Design a protein around this ligand. Structure first.
Ligand code: CL
Ligand code: CL
Lengths: 124, 174
């Protein structure tokens, strides 16, 4: 199943936000934990071969999750006062090179000091 | 941490002012069981304020489903279809369609083009009216201060005071 939907399997019902809700894909309506489901397939991972390209893509997401103040769209309103924790659920393929894992782990640590938990899952 | 609240949402372009009931818990969203008040942009602060209060009275303090793995408020109700992502988008599309047909827009881009949005929340503590920055046509967001530009009113505010505060927030939109 798609990565975004797979992320929902481990989360309480009603958590799924309407499409393109900034960077947030899921919202625990009771606890306030937000989840952003990001995925990198084999082709995109291969495409971002130049240094810092992988780090950028992830950092680009991290900044949005962290600098989030308020979003209101598709008849739904969410602001940062509601959010108690922020997390990026990242899917990475098997052809991820060591050099690319270096960028991944770098973004993980960047996000953590940005107050964002970056959780990486290796997809077969 | 979470206390019982009531919500509403205000959309305003040149042609109208639209107040809808929002419902939820942490997040709040268009309630298909809530009420809508349409008005001309020159509605009195009394009427406009009673429009906001009547909409708030129909707001629900509700979660998608019961949770056992955590603490949940003893007052909260449950409604899975409200929170359902497909139903959410579809009732939004109907909300949008009804406005284009009513005002003869014949296009979504002219509907939202000159549209500002204000968030309303109410609890035991205060009535908060929050302006937004019209980021994209169908996306509003942070103004973005922290968040000093909100219109915060007493819970005992008169309807006229509430309608007046709403217009103050509408003039603070970016
Ligand atoms: Cl909240
Ligand atoms: Cl770093």
């Amino acid at each position: 199943m798609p990565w975004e939907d797979y992320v929902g399997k481990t989360l309480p019902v009603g958590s799924r936000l309407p499409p393109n809700f900034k960077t947030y894909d899921y919202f625990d309506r009771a606890t306030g934990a937000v989840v952003s489901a990001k995925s990198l397939d084999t082709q995109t991972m291969a495409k971002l071969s130049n240094p810092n390209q992988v780090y950028s893509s992830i950092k680009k997401n991290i900044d949005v999750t962290a600098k989030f103040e308020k979003a209101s769209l598709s008849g739904v309103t969410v602001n940062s006062s509601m959010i108690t924790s922020k997390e990026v659920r990242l899917a990475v393929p098997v052809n991820t090179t060591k050099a690319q894992w270096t960028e991944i782990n770098r973004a993980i640590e960047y996000g953590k000091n940005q107050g964002v938990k970056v959780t990486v899952t290796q997809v077969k | 941490d979470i206390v019982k609240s009531a919500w509403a949402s205000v959309k305003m372009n040149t042609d109208f002012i639209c107040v809808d009931t929002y419902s939820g818990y942490r997040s709040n969203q268009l309630d298909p069981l809530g009420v809508q008040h349409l008005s001309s942009p020159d509605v009195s602060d009394l009427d406009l304020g009673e429009m906001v209060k009547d909409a708030l009275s129909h707001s629900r303090f509700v979660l998608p489903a019961p949770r056992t793995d955590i603490w949940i408020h003893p007052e909260v109700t449950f409604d899975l279809d409200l929170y359902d992502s497909r139903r959410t988008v579809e009732r939004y599309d109907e909300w949008v369609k009804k406005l284009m047909v009513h005002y003869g827009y014949k296009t979504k881009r002219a509907l939202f083009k000159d549209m500002k949005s204000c968030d309303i929340c109410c609890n035991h503590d205060a009535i908060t009216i929050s302006p937004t920055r019209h980021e994209k046509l169908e996306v509003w967001g942070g103004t973005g201060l922290k968040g000093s530009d909100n219109v915060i009113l007493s819970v005992d505010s008169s309807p006229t005071e509430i309608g007046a505060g709403l217009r103050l927030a509408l003039s603070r939109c970016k």
